[PDB]
Amino acid sequence: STGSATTTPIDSLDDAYITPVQIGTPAQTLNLDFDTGSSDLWVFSSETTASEVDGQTIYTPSKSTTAKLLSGATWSISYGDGSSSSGDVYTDTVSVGGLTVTGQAVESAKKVSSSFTEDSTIDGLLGLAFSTLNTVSPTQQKTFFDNAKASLDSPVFTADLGYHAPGTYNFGFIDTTAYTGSITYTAVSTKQGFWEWTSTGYAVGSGTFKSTSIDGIADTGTTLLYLPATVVSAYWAQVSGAKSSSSVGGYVFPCSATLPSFTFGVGSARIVIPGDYIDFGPISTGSSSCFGGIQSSAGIGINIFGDVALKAAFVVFNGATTPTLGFASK
């Protein structure tokens, strides 16, 4: 089997991407944030504290003839950005782009943190990291991909995120028309539960490539590119007037600037992030100070190849017995 679904930016900055997901019988369609940095499929629901729902579409398990309470199971998650959610668990039928999994754990939120409430466009998350990170207790549950994998034509999914435009998540096949040149595959460590890999280096603009190993995670659920302070300083030094602002929480730059591109290495291959992908707009409405899309990972404890990086590539998440990651230009 295969599936293919369009993923759409939630706003004009590509702060996140939502993908429609069918849950239950009859289907209830929710727009979920596909997150290769976590492993829980959780939704706003009829059980979510009423004051914490503000415009989201909810899953109502009592209206699904295939929903079953997973007795005794609870979940609770905290994300790298400080947000969080928790609740109980149902199993139900879940379909993405024509690919159906029966008995998928659907984690129903009883509580969500303010950042989720305040984002009306995201109805929940669909985790695509390794199932070892799933938070369901006392019996850990499998991700949608893990459940689908054996049925897929090939045990893979691909992320093709757009810049200021829709893109595509495919399951079970590689669309050879969706990228240019070849896909370069690189090793993955699953030791921390992530799609963790090692970039071979970077360049700033038309500058020389610096060969250096940068361990990090491919994370569709993180907006920005978080890299070591040395790398990030080298990038922003090429933008007149850019500076790190402790008050704002990162590098800012004059909105009048033209940003240089940023290149990262994948083996001997190179992925070029155009400068415009690094612009996250005014820090507050009407400001001429703009927020940068490349930020320091210092104090995160891990480097994160988030959407800024991934949207410059066609990315293969290869879930073969020994997982790997592939990157192509597009």
UniProtKB/Swiss-Prot annotation:
Which is a GO BP term held by this UniProt record?
A: proteolysis
- In short, the EC number is 3.4.23.22
Q: Where is the active site?
A: 35, 199
- Domain Peptidase A1 span(s) in chain numbering: 17-328
Q: Which UniProt keywords apply?
A: Aspartyl protease, Disulfide bond, Hydrolase, Protease, Signal, Zymogen
GO molecular function terms attached to this record: aspartic-type endopeptidase activity
Disulfide cross-links:
255-290
Listed under catalytic activity are:
Hydrolysis of proteins with specificity similar to that of pepsin A, prefers hydrophobic residues at P1 and P1', but does not cleave 14-Ala-|-Leu-15 in the B chain of insulin or Z-Glu-Tyr. Clots milk
Looking at its record, which EC class is this enzyme? Answer: hydrolase
Q: Which family does it belong to?
A: Belongs to the peptidase A1 family.
Q: What is this protein called?
A: Endothiapepsin
- The record lists the organism as Cryphonectria parasitica (Chestnut blight fungus)
Q: Upper taxonomic classification of the species?
A: Eukaryota, Fungi, Dikarya, Ascomycota, Pezizomycotina
Q: Which gene encodes it?
A: EAPA
